[PDB]
Amino acid sequence: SGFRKMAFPSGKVEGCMVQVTCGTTTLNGLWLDDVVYCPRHVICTSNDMLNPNYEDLLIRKSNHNFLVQAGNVQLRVIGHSMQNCVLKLKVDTANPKTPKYKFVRIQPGQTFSVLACYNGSPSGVYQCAMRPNFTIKGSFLNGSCGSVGFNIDYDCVSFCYMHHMELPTGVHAGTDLEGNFYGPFVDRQTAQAAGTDTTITVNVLAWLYAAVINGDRWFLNRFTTTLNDFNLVAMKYNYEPLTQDHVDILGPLSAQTGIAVLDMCASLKELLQNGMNGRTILGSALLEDEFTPFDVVRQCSGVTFQ
Amino acid sequence: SGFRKMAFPSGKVEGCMVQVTCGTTTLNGLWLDDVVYCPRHVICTSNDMLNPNYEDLLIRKSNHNFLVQAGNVQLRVIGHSMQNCVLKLKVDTANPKTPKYKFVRIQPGQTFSVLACYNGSPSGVYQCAMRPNFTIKGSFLNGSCGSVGFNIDYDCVSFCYMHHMELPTGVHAGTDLEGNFYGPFVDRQTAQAAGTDTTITVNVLAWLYAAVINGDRWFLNRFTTTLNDFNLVAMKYNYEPLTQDHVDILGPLSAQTGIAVLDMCASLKELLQNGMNGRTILGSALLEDEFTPFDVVRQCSGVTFQ
C-alpha cells in the first residue's frame, strides 16, 4: 500500500491566506473571523531589519497605512495591535470561509503541514517537522513570510506555525500564532546561532515500523538491546535519548506488527554502526525522522479529515 | 531558501471529491459540473475482480443502484455510461464548487499531485511522478480507488490521474479521466507485470541544478562528457537516453546558474560511477528523479496558482 511524506489537505487554510502590504513591504496574512494575523516585520523596511524598534515603528503607522487584500476584495482595518512578534488587525468583515480553529504551541519532534504562499496566494503544501533546536528547514523564497503550518484534527484546523525569517545558515525560524518564537530566535537580521540539532529517535523507530508494514523487513534482526544500552549508542550518533514515554507512544505500532519496541531499537542500533550497505528502506538510504508515530498510524489506518 | 517535494494546493479538488457506493463496494468519485467520474470497478464484488464482464455487470445495474454522497448532500443520478474503465453518472445538480478544468493524458517522467481520499473524504496530498513504465508508487490503502492526480496551471486544474488498482508488486496503476489506462494494465486481479523501470535522467539533472541554487555544490567538477559518451554510461546504470530536447528543456536552469548542461551531465556521470561517498545532496543520498525541470523553476522563482 506504500508510505509517503503526506501533507494535510490545505483547502480549509487557502480560504484564509490574505495579502498584507504596509508601505514598502508585502507579505502574507492569516484571516480568521474579523482579524488578520501577520508577522510584525511587515512594518519594517530593508535597513530596519538590522535593529528594529517595533514599538516606535508601529506608532508611526496608522490604520489606513495597512492594506489587506484577500484575492480581489480589499479588507478595511479598524484596529491594530502588536502581540509579541505578530500583528492583530481587526477588519471590517468576518472571514466567511473561517474554519474551526485552535492556536497551539507544538513541541520539538512534532510534524505539521506548511502552505507556502506569496503575495497572499497559495503556492504549495508540504510536511515538515519542528527540529529539536526549534528550527525547520524550509522552502521559503522572498516574500513567503506569514506562511502558516498547521495540523487538522478530523474537523478542526490547529494552527501552530507562522514563518518569520530565514537564518544565514539556510534553515528557518518562526512563531506560534501568539507571536512567541520557537527557540531563541528574534526577528532581526543578525547572526543567529541555530544550535546543535539531533535526530528525533522516536520518529525514526516509528518510521521503521511503517516499513515493516509496507514490505521492507531486511533490517529485522534477532539481536536486542536495553534502554540504557541503546542510549549509550544514541548520543554517540547524536540521537535523542529514548524515555519510557517514547516506548509507550510506539505501543500501537508495536502490537499491530508483533515486534517489541526494544527489538526495533536493536535494528536501529545495528543501522547506526553499520550503515545501510547499499540497501534502502522505502526508497530512502537515510534514517528518516519527519514521521511521528501518530503520522504512521494515520497512513497505515486511513484516517480522514472531513 | 531550500527545496522540497512540493504538492499543489488541493483546495480546488477537495470540493469535488464525492463518495460513490454501488451495492457492495464503496470508493471515491470526481464531481465536475453535473457528472460524477469514478472507477468502473465499483460495480464489481470481491470475487468479480478475477474476471469481470463489465458490460454485462453494468447492465444489471440501474440508476437508483448508484448512491453518490457529497459530504451530507446526496446526489440524484439520472444517467450512466461506461467510457473505457470509468463511469460517467449524470446527477441532479451541477457542482457549485466546480473549478476550471482540463482533462489531460500526461507523459512518463511528468509529475503531479495526488489527493488521497477515503469514502469520499480527503486525507492527504503529495507529489509523485509517472514512472517510465507507466506505474506510480503510491500510498493507497483499502478504499482509495478514485483518488485523482492533478496539476494546476495558474487558474486551471488539469486532471490527469485516477487511481484504479494496486499491483501485487506493490506499485499502483490508473487511468486518465477518459478511462484509458497508463501502461498495459487492465482492471482485474491477475498477475500484471510492471515492466522494467528506469530513472528519469532529465529530472535528475534538473534536481542537481536546484541543489546548486540552494547551497550544495560539492558535486561540481571540471570534467565533461559528450551526449553520446554520457549515454553509454546512462544505459549501463539504467538511465533514460538524453535527447537534445532534454538539453533544451534544461536551458533556463542552465542559463540562470551558469553551468552548461553537459557540465552537469559529467557531474552525474561521476555520481553514477563513484556513488556519493557519505555526502548528500539536499538532505538525500539518492539521485532524486521526481522533480521535472518545470517543477524546479516554480520552486526557485515562486510561481503562484491563485
Facing B124 at nearest CB: one of A6, A143, A144: A6
Question: Nearest Cα to B249, choosing from B295, B182, B198, B189?
Answer: B295
Strands B35-39 and B86-91: antiparallel
Residues, chain B = 306
Contacts of A7 in chain B (CB under 8 A): 7, 124-126
The CA distance from A56 to the nearest CA of chain B, in Å, is 30
**Distance in angstroms (rounded) separating the CA atoms of residues A291 and A298:** 11
- List the CATH number of the domain containing A78: 2.40.10.10
Task: Tell me the residues of chain B between 217 and 236 that have a Cβ less than 8 Å away from chain A.
Answer: none
Euclidean distance between CA atoms A267 and B163, whole angstroms: 35
Quick one: which of A199, A214, A227, A213 has its CA closest to A288?
A199
Grid cell 517510465 — which residue?
Answer: B132
Q: What is the CATH number of the domain that holds A245?
A: 1.10.1840.10
Number of CB atoms found within 10 A of residue B292's CB? 20
Chain-chain contact of A2 with B170 (C-beta, under 8 angstroms): yes
The residue among A294, A293, A271 whose CA lies nearest residue A284 is A271
Those residues whose C-beta lies under 8 Å from the C-beta of residue A225, and which sit 6 or more positions away, are A233, A262, A265, A266, A269
Pairing assessment for the beta strands B121-129 and B101-103 based on DSSP bridges: unpaired
Contact A30, A148 (CB under 8 A): yes
Known active-site residue B41: yes
User: Cα–Cα distance between B207 and A11 in angstroms, integer?
Assistant: 28
CA distances B136 to A275, B130, B172, Å, are 28, 6, 5
Pairing state of beta strands A17-22 and B77-83? Answer: unpaired
**A74 in Cβ contact with A67 (< 8 Å):** yes
What cell was used for A219? 533490517
- Cα separation, B114 vs B160, whole angstroms: 10
Beta strands in chain B (DSSP E): 17-22, 25-32, 35-39, 66-70, 73-75, 77-83, 86-91, 101-103, 111-118, 121-129, 148-153, 156-166, 172-175
Could you say which of B121, B123, B303 has the minimum Cβ distance to residue A123?
B303
Determine phi and psi for B174, rounding to 5 degrees. Answer: -160, -170
CB-nearest to B2 from A7, A71, A137 is A137
The residue written with cell numbers 492526480 in the block is B149
Query: Which technique?
Result: X-ray
Give the count of beta carbons closer than 10 Å to the beta carbon of residue A231: 18
Residue A3 φ/ψ, nearest 5 degrees:
-140, 145
**Beta-bridge partner residues of A116:** A124
Looking only at Cα atoms, what is the longest distance across chain A? 69
8-state DSSP, B172:
E
Task: Decide if A9 and B139 are in contact by the 8 Å CB cutoff.
Answer: no
Identify the DSSP state of A210. Answer: H
Residues 6+ apart with CB under 8 A from B11: A9, A10, A11, A12, A14, A15, A122
Three cell numbers, residue A49: 531589519
- Tell me which residue has cell 460513490: B20
List, in sequence order, every residue forming a beta bridge with B21; answer none if it has no partner.
B26, B67
* Parallel, antiparallel or unpaired: strands A101-103 and A156-166: parallel
**Which amino acid, one-letter code, is at B162?**
M
Give the best residue of B1, B169, B197 to mutate against chain A (max A CB count within 10 A).
B1
Q: Hey, what long-range contacts does B279-284 have (CB within 8 A, 24 or more apart)?
A: B279/B218, B280/A286, B280/B216, B281/B207, B281/B208, B281/B211, B281/B216, B281/B219, B282/B2, B282/B3, B282/B210, B282/B211, B282/B214, B282/B215, B282/B216, B283/A137, B283/A286, B284/A284, B284/A286
Site of grid cell 487557502: A14
Q: What is the DSSP letter of B40?
A: G
Determine the Cα–Cα distance for residues A147 and A121; give it in Å rounded to an integer.
10
Query: Nearest-CA neighbor of A131 among A114, A109, A148?
Result: A109
| Number of CB atoms found within 10 A of residue A218's CB | 13
Domain range enclosing A223:
201-301
B169 in contact with A, Cβ within 8 Å: no
Between the alpha carbon of residue B82 and those of residues B88, B178, B181, B278, the distances in Å are: 6, 10, 14, 53
The counts of H helices and E strands in chain A are 8, 13
- Kind and range of the H or E run holding A213: helix A201-213
Using an 8 Å Cβ cutoff, are A119 and A26 in contact?
Answer: yes
Comparing CB atoms, the residue among A3, A124, A286 nearest residue B7 is A124
CA distance B182 to B171: 13
Q: Does A305 sit within 8 Å of B126, measured CB to CB?
A: no
Using a CB-CB cut-off of 8 Å, the residues of chain B touching A284 are 284, 286
Closest to A18 (Cα-Cα) out of A84, A92, A106: A92
Residue at B161: amino acid letter: Y
Q: Measuring CA to CA, how many Å separate B103 from each of A255, A268, B106?
A: 44, 46, 9
